[PDB]
Amino acid sequence: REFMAVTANNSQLLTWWHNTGEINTQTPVADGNVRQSGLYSVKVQTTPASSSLYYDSFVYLAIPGNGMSDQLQYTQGYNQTQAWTSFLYSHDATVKISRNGSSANSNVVIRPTSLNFPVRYDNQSVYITVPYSPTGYRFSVEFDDDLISLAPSGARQPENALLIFASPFENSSTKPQPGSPNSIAPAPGRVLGLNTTSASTVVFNPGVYYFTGHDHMVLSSSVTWVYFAPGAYVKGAVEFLSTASEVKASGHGVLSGEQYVWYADPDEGYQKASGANNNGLRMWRGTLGNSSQTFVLNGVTVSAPPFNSMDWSGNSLDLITCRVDDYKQVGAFYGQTDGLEMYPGTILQDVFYHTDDDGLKMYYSNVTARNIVMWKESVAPVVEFGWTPRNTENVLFDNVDVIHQAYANAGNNPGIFGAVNNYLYAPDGLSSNHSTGNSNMTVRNITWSNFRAEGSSSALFRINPIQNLDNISIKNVSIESFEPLSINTTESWMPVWYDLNNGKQITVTDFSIEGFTVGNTTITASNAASVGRIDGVDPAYAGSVHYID
Ligand SMILES: *[C@@H]1O[C@H](CO)[C@@H](O)[C@H](O)[C@H]1NC(C)=O
Ligand SMILES: *[C@@H]1O[C@H](CO)[C@@H](O)[C@H](O)[C@H]1NC(C)=O
Ligand SMILES: *[C@@H]1O[C@H](CO)[C@@H](O)[C@H](O)[C@H]1NC(C)=O
Ligand SMILES: *[C@@H]1O[C@H](CO)[C@@H](O)[C@H](O)[C@H]1NC(C)=O
Ligand SMILES: *[C@@H]1O[C@H](CO)[C@@H](O)[C@H](O)[C@H]1NC(C)=O
Ligand SMILES: *[C@@H]1O[C@H](CO)[C@@H](O)[C@H](O)[C@H]1NC(C)=O
Ligand SMILES: *[C@@H]1O[C@H](CO)[C@@H](O)[C@H](O)[C@H]1NC(C)=O
Ligand SMILES: *[C@@H]1O[C@H](CO)[C@@H](O)[C@H](O)[C@H]1NC(C)=O
Ligand SMILES: *[C@@H]1O[C@H](CO)[C@@H](O)[C@H](O)[C@H]1NC(C)=O
Ligand SMILES: *[C@@H]1O[C@H](CO)[C@@H](O)[C@H](O)[C@H]1NC(C)=O
Ligand SMILES: *[C@@H]1O[C@H](CO)[C@@H](O)[C@H](O)[C@H]1NC(C)=O
């Protein structure tokens, strides 16, 4: 009979397919269709490896502009595309990647490079041995003959990326069990009524769903759980109306914003927002009441966000906290596609971020984020804590691998650790005016450890002390190489700042750097400037920046 995909559904491996897959690299796909990679084929086999059968795993594809040519102006203008595949496993597995029959053999580089997964080449295919881990893995497979140079940094990156998201099975806390109370399971196609349903749980089983570019998933006040099953592909954006103790989004399905134009404004027919009013449609949105709420986000893959990925509405955001795990953001080619907000007390781990703006937004206290892989695009720092002076303390960001960066100029506000200017006076974040800070606020007890920047990188830090800084520690940070000196994105700095109202000088206390390396060179106080390119620390703060060797 004619060939057909064969998927796995057993205790060791789960893969899925879409019969409405559409090969398309220039226009929007049909409402009920799913853009599929025409370049990469992926199959998975549970070890031990043998002549046994390999199971097909659907490879999704995201492209800049989502097929809307008039939206390309809102991207960086690169021709890069991003493909990815997800599967669940509970045992070591071999991932077999195949390109078309006419493609020549080419070695690959897996990022993060610290994974060191066994790789073998045979039968015009690439075999990667992915070990099982309860936290799973999220990595990039980069073919040497697919690398291109991104101007003006010259960064060497895949023209057609392929991401592999291997995740653990779903337990009863992330998957609606049989007999789950008061649930609703919409049929494939246009999804209606969720904004008025009396259901508590919305279940998206395998299939394709869409809300169009002029509506989104507004969930009624009774909905406290939305589930995206592995094999479910939902075109839309989520907004909870519930003010309950917990609102949750889980499952390993996909939530895609590809039908929305950049900066789509829900209050204006979803047309591009007027005057950068900051009302672009978020992929995750909620609204607080007068009581605490926890946002649990687990397993989901978000693709093609039309604006910031997430923000909660409310006068007091101190009552919201997040619990994020095994989550990914892909195909975020548009500008201002920020990573998630990590509200007070948040625990975020095992995440993959493709972002063209603020990545790890350190705006709240008692936050812990670890095991993150980031494909930083061309705008904003990897870590952001500028824009507005704040009282923030007790933060730990650990094990963050920035596998790529492609900045272009100083105006992009480049840097691994950055704090841009005050948004109220410098909307684009860059200004020589450093007298709008707040001497009455302090960011304290911050730890950024085990950060790794692969390939060419921007500056270690570009920090505006818009409020006092105290006890900030950088422990273990490796930069493989620096971007070109000519694009002015690699020199680190920290200018002296002053209080907006009384002119009191903002203070910096105990800012330590340890285990900082550039390529094969260890950075110390002696070569901090000449090799580490740290030459912009204000003389007033120089004595507060310590190199622990
Ligand atoms: C086959 O794959 C190569 C990359 O290996 C790609 O450049 C080429 O366009 C593909 N052939 C076609 C026409 O599908
Ligand atoms: C994509 O852009 C790169 C430069 O960044 C260029 O080398 C490559 O030829 C372009 N690909 C196509 C199909 O034009
Ligand atoms: C529910 O959402 C639909 C759009 O899908 C909208 O037309 C309708 O007015 C909404 N219902 C209410 C009560 O807001
Ligand atoms: C795997 O099988 C289970 C049980 O029949 C089913 O609920 C699930 O949808 C299947 N997964 C897929 C997408 O094939
Ligand atoms: C929060 O609002 C509810 C509903 O109006 C009310 O019953 C409750 O007393 C309020 N809680 C506080 C802290 O005032
Ligand atoms: C941080 O957690 C501590 C408990 O260790 C608590 O006292 C403090 O209020 C929290 N800070 C914020 C702003 O949530
Ligand atoms: C400091 O922050 C860490 C997180 O990095 C937290 O575990 C610890 O309780 C905080 N205590 C202080 C003030 O050092
Ligand atoms: C800096 O900006 C503030 C806020 O707009 C303004 O009040 C002040 O005059 C500016 N100072 C300089 C150096 O122009
Ligand atoms: C920094 O890396 C070294 C590698 O030898 C490791 O021993 C140390 O624990 C790391 N420091 C932190 C705080 O993770
Ligand atoms: C980098 O950008 C800053 C701010 O735009 C500017 O002051 C500096 O001169 C630039 N670096 C150089 C010397 O080109
Ligand atoms: C260190 O890196 C530089 C630049 O890549 C290279 O020229 C040099 O040979 C390297 N030295 C060692 C000992 O690896």
Swiss-Prot record:
It catalyses: Hydrolysis of pullulan to isopanose (6-alpha-maltosylglucose). Coiled coil: none annotated. It is found in: Secreted. One of its GO terms (molecular function) is isopullulanase activity. SUPFAM superfamilies: Dextranase, N-terminal domain, Pectin lyase-like. GO terms for cellular component: extracellular region. Pfam families: B_solenoid_dext (PF18841), Glyco_hydro_49 (PF03718), Glyco_hydro_49N (PF17433), IPU_b_solenoid (PF18783). Glycans are attached at residues 9, 79, 100, 123, 171, 195, 290, 366, 433, 440, 445, 471, 476, 488, 520. It is an enzyme of class 3 (hydrolase). InterPro entries: B_solenoid_dext, Dextranase_N-ter, Glyco_hydro_49_C, Glyco_hydro_49_N_dom, IPU_b_solenoid, Pectin_lyas_fold, Pectin_lyase_fold/virulence. The keyword Glycoprotein applies. Its EC number is 3.2.1.57. Its main location: secreted. Keywords: Glycoprotein, Glycosidase, Hydrolase, Secreted, Signal. Hydrolyzes pullulan, a linear polymer which is composed of maltotriose units with alpha-1,6 glucosidic linkages, to produce isopanose (Glca1-4Glca1-6Glc). N-glycosylated. This is Isopullulanase. It comes from Aspergillus niger.
